[PDB]
Design a protein around this ligand. Structure first.
Ligand code: HEC
Ligand code: HEC
Ligand code: HEC
Ligand SMILES: C[C@H](CCC(=O)O)[C@H]1CC[C@H]2[C@@H]3CC[C@@H]4C[C@H](O)CC[C@]4(C)[C@H]3C[C@H](O)[C@]12C
Length: 71
């Protein structure tokens, strides 16, 4: 399947799966969550543990605006 882009007004956000599968061997960080995670995602989650927050905790991955968002 293909990567997805989140259409943030300020600039597209690419989500590259290959890098994540390799770097986050604990698949259950994202997969087999109970219901509600598709409806639940948004800016708050993205800027918290949904994206940026995991990058901070794991000490790797983009944490600056322009590293995630790119027109
Ligand atoms: C969140 C940061 C994730 C982690 C960590 C892992 N996966 Fe993932 N997976 C995630 C998303 C948002 C998607 C769909 C969008 C996309 O870019 O693909 C997926 C998709 C998969 C798939 C389908 C892939 C394909 O057919 O190309 C598989 C088989 C899958 N995910 C498995 C998987 C495993 C085994 C992981 C740990 C090693 C893993 N994923 C990490 C989100 C996230
Ligand atoms: C942990 C549970 C993560 C979540 C949730 C998200 N990301 Fe992530 N990401 C994570 C790690 C440990 C890394 C480092 C991978 C590496 O090999 O450097 C990343 C990396 C990225 C990248 C850069 C990939 C690259 O090839 O350099 C991007 C663009 C990225 N992450 C974006 C991203 C987004 C948009 C997420 C939410 C939708 C997200 N990540 C979640 C760990 C985790
Ligand atoms: C990845 C790790 C990100 C970093 C670092 C920053 N942003 Fe972000 N942001 C990210 C995603 C995946 C999303 C989309 C949420 C969704 O609904 O799917 C966003 C969202 C925004 C928004 C709202 C966009 C909209 O509603 O259309 C804004 C205004 C925004 N982001 C700005 C922004 C700034 C200024 C940042 C640095 C301080 C920043 N983001 C970091 C992913 C990530
Ligand atoms: C559930 C995990 C981990 C974050 C958490 O613990 O909540 C998060 C990490 C990235 C999130 C995905 C990002 C791309 C998509 C954003 C959509 O708007 C909702 C569905 C998707 C596919 C999201 C589903 C889910 O919200 C995920 C996989």
């Amino acid at each position: 399947a293909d990567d997805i882009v989140l259409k943030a007004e300020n600039g597209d956000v690419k989500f590259p799966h290959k890098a994540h599968q390799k770097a986050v061997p604990d698949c259950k960080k994202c997969h087999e969550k109970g219901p509600g995670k598709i409806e639940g995602f948004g800016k708050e989650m993205a800027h918290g543990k949904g994206c940026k927050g995991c990058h901070e905790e794991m000490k790797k991955g983009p944490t600056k605006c322009g590293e995630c968002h790119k027109k």
